[PDB]
């Protein structure tokens, strides 16, 4: 219990050791890294947490940042495992550190985790993000932080000082800066920080990659089922304030200063009450408040940056899951649900193309319908279901990722690609959704090693196999064994090689949904532009 006491620039901390089927780990949960964004501070970039006297209790996780609670399926697991599992509060900027036991003698590489949740939800205290096993097995340091979401994290009035926007990304960054001056106290090496995140967390990672000021805060990146260039990852200044003003209106407000001042006077829950209203209707996989292209945090759209940027001296690990789209369809796509097998009819399918592909012309839709239709089985409910699943998945995740990957690899970086295609045996989601969005996380963190859970012996080995890849990447910038084991090749714009990640061994494959993504990234743009 002598290792559970550590001092950081702010003050003294008292942690707790966590048990593991392999050994204890020292964890420090709830370290305050910013001054709480209460009242006057709401909507403003974060200010560094001021020094404190005495010892801070870092034994239990801290509050989850105020957010909407997804209540689609009351009592369902696949839906509740992502909801806040601690009291909500605007006072939520805290972070956590998981370091080996005993504390490493030499500086050990660090892994910083940014959670997903469409920028409207999420928390570092979710069970599926427990870093004890990953830290215990690969003996690395792990840090995860909470960052503002929803209006509190991203409501923006582009240009204003009261509500500049992207403050959520600023929280993430302040936490990365906290890691630079303090991780060494826990034996972490600030000259070897690797960021990894999933969904919106991956998008965030990508944005820190595209934001100069964040560049001196890490050295490697992992983007899981998400990219900064997705059609949902950002919104323009225009739309940004259109939404911000709508929220104010719905809430009785009221001049930017005036609008915000009023906004600061409303209860957190009142704002969350009207969060979804401001969404330019009919779509799935779209969120109200997200990062804004304002010229500050991002000098240009992520797409613009990803093409003009020089990525030399950078290693990136990117990937998606077998069925990225399935998940979202039950939130609006006609005929879709978790309670049956969603064998939609050609009618529903065609209507679903419009929900799964928001703000697009009628001719654009027909273009989608053409490509995703099996003209030998135009009416087959089974295929139409997997088709609308791919539609949403390719459009929102696979193709954005595939493009970033090729542009990165092609412009000086080392990229490794993967497709997590193994369904967890504990999956509560219906069998038809396959390996849905965000379901590779539980394995990357090695949750199968936890006894209280019921995973298979092979899945525990698998989890271990995966963690090594991640840990290897963190240490060397390369996944495979630093062997005589199947080799994972770098993803090149040329061969476009990636590997499947299931119980079977690494299998190398070319093309990452190449034919489809040509539609999304190359043709569709021209089609829309011409009409």
């Amino acid at each position: 219990d002598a290792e559970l006491l550590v001092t950081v620039r702010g003050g003294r901390l008292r942690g707790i050791r966590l048990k593991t089927p392999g050994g204890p780990v020292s964890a420090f949960l709830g370290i305050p890294f910013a001054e709480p964004p209460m009242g006057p501070r709401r909507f403003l970039p974060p200010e560094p947490k001021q020094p404190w006297s005495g010892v801070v209790d870092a034994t239990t996780f801290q509050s989850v940042c105020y957010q909407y609670v997804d209540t689609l399926y009351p009592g369902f697991e696949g839906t509740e495992m992502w909801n806040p599992n601690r009291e909500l509060s605007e006072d939520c900027l805290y972070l956590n550190v998981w370091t080996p036991y005993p504390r490493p003698t030499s500086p050990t590489p660090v892994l910083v985790w940014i959670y997903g949740g469409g920028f409207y939800s999420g928390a570092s205290s979710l069970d599926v993000y427990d870093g004890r096993f990953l830290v215990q097995a690969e003996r690395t340091v792990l840090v995860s932080m909470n960052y503002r979401v929803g209006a509190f994290g991203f409501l923006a009035l582009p240009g204003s000082r009261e509500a500049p926007g992207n403050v959520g990304l600023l929280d993430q960054r302040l936490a990365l800066q906290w890691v630079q001056e303090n991780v060494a106290a826990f034996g972490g090496d600030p000259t070897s920080v690797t960021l990894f995140g999933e969904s919106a967390g991956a998008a965030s990672v990508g944005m820190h990659l595209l934001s100069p000021p964040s560049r001196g805060l890490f050295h490697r990146a992992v983007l899981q089922s998400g990219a900064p260039n997705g059609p949902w990852a950002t919104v323009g200044m225009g739309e940004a304030r259109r939404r911000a003003t709508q929220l104010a209106h719905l809430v009785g407000c009221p001049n930017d200063t005036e609008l915000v001042a009023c906004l600061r006077t409303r209860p957190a829950q009142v704002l969350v009450n009207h969060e979804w209203h401001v969404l330019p209707q009919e779509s799935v996989f779209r969120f109200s408040f997200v990062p804004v292209v304002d010229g500050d945090f991002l000098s240009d759209t992520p797409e613009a940056l990803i093409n003009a940027g020089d990525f030399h001296g950078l290693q990136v690990l990117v990937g998606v899951v077998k069925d990225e789209g399935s998940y979202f369809l039950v939130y609006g796509a006609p005929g879709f649900s978790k309670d049956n097998e969603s064998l939609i009819s050609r009618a529903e399918f065609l209507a679903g193309v419009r929900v799964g592909v928001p703000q697009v012309s009628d001719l654009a839709a027909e273009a989608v319908v053409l490509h995703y239709t099996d003209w030998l089985h135009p009416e087959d409910p089974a295929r139409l279901r997997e088709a609308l699943s791919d539609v949403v998945g390719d459009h929102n995740v696979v193709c954005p990722v595939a493009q970033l990957a090729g542009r990165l690899a092609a412009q000086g970086a080392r990229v490794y690609a993967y497709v997590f295609e193994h369904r967890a045996s504990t999956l509560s989601w219906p069998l038809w959704m396959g390996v849905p969005h965000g379901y590779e996380i539980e394995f990357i963190f090695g949750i199968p090693l936890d006894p209280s859970r019921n995973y298979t012996a092979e899945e525990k080995i698998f989890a271990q196999r995966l963690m090594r890849y991640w840990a290897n990447f963190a240490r060397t910038g390369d996944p495979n064994e630093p062997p005589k084991a199947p080799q994972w090749p770098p993803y090149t714009a040329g061969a476009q090689q990636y590997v499947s990640l299931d119980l079977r061994p690494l299998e190398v494959r070319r093309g990452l949904r190449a034919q489809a993504c040509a539609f999304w990234n190359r043709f569709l743009p021209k089609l829309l532009s011409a009409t």
């Binding site: 957010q67 009351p74 979804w276 209203h277 209707q281 009919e282 799935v284 929900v355």
Partner: protein
């Protein structure tokens, strides 16, 4: 009747509505995020769809 109850920021729990009906407030167009359930049958709007029920018991799910 035994129905669900919650807000935009609370987890759904069971409650006894009795003879009143129950409701399910959601966003009208996709994403049709559920915004709240409870007792009674309140008005909706362009963005607010409200579905009511009685018989089923725990029907406002």
């Amino acid at each position: 009747t035994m129905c669900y109850s919650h807000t935009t920021t609370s987890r759904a729990i069971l409650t006894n509505c009795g003879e009143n009906s129950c409701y399910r407030k959601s966003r009208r167009h996709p994403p049709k995020m559920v915004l709240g359930r409870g007792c009674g049958c309140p008005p909706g709007d362009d963005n607010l769809e409200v579905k009511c029920c009685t018989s089923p018991d725990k029907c406002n799910y």
